[PDB]
């Protein structure tokens, strides 16, 4: 009864995220005047969010509406690994976008000598390698012995894998994003003083607020409930803070191409 209702609003979110993240890629794959490192830092974020909304998220919706895992155990292992990998790569794409914008507004003339076509490629390599190191954590060593029932798909919640990956996958990128965007905000107030602090404060506030509002509930419920045995939350709040991190990948195409005038001229041209 309510399974079709929850499934159709979930599939609406899936189609919205897939269409948005394929529009961000199509804005660059056809418009050849977008060829810089700043545009590739949005392209790889759209690639990570498209892999999540295309390959991971239909199986998350099926797992939510059915109640059990209707595929094999190797498909469950692949799905959990690709889930952690694509979400971690999305968060680190946000982090490297933030670093690029900081050393773009702090060194405007010395930007093509400090962000070259080789160091941005190496930054993509080093964020995707660390996402892949975190996601293939429990695949050989970081796993307590799971039950052998094929119709369950349990995520890994080891204390020590949750804490380390939570730290190095949210709390260091959160601190970096906050530092670089507060310095960007300080520069954007000319380092009419009312119409300048309001616009930059609103623009950076929605950018950092969507990120924290989608990912801080998950990364606050997950390490705290894995360490303090007194705090055990409900099972509705876990699904809510689980799906908010999925919602971030559908929120991201509305924000980051609309924070670029060339992308704003290409996005409405490709749709």
């Amino acid at each position: 009864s309510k399974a079709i209702l929850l499934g159709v609003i979930l599939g609406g979110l899936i189609l919205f995220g897939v269409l948005g993240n394929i529009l961000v890629i199509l804005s660059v794959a056809c418009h050849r005047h977008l060829h810089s490192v700043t545009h590739y830092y949005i392209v790889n974020l759209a690639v990570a969010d498209l892999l999540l909304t295309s390959t991971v998220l239909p199986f998350s919706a099926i797992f939510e509406v059915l109640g059990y895992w209707a595929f094999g155990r190797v498909f469950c292992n692949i799905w959990a690994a690709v889930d952690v990998l694509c979400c971690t790569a999305s968060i680190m794409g946000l982090c490297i976008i933030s670093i690029d914008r900081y050393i773009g507004v702090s060194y405007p003339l010395r930007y093509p000598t400090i962000v070259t076509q080789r160091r941005g490629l190496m930054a993509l390599l080093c964020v995707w390698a660390l996402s892949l190191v975190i996601s293939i954590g429990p695949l050989f060593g970081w796993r307590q012995p799971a039950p052998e029932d094929e119709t369950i798909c349990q995520i890994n919640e080891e204390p020590g894998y949750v804490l380390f990956s939570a730290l190095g996958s949210f709390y260091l990128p959160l601190a970096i994003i906050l530092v670089m965007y507060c310095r960007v905000y300080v520069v954007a107030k000319r380092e009419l003083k009312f119409s300048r602090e309001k616009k930059a404060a609103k623009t950076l506030g929605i950018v950092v607020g969507c990120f924290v509002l989608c990912w801080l509930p998950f990364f606050l419920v997950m390490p705290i409930g894995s360490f303090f045995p007194d705090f055990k939350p409900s099972e509705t709040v876990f699904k809510i803070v689980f799906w908010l991190g999925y919602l971030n990948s559908c929120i991201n195409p509305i924000i980051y191409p609309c924070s670029s005038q060339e992308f704003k001229k290409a996005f409405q041209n490709v749709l």
Partner: nanobody
Amino acid sequence: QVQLQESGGGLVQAGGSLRLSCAASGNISAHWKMGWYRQAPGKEREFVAGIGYANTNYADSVKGRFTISRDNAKNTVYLQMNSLKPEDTAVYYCAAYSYYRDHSYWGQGTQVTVSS
């Protein structure tokens, strides 16, 4: 905390019948599965049966002749094993695992022997 304590096992002739039980001494949520697994001396743990709210699952070697049942009021799970072949001689554990979170309580174990 939940301490699954299973019983009911013993010594069965070939083709006989047994009825395993697993109690809880606590509370398992209704959105959790509860199953029976089996480990032979020499091999590893294999899944045998499981009942939750979303499905009832069996292993394909015990699919026709085993029957899992659950009483959520007394928080107990029964496994009626009929027509016992001489390869079910193993240790049977009961588990109270979850579907999507790394939560698994495990029983002590009960030896079930089939001979001929």
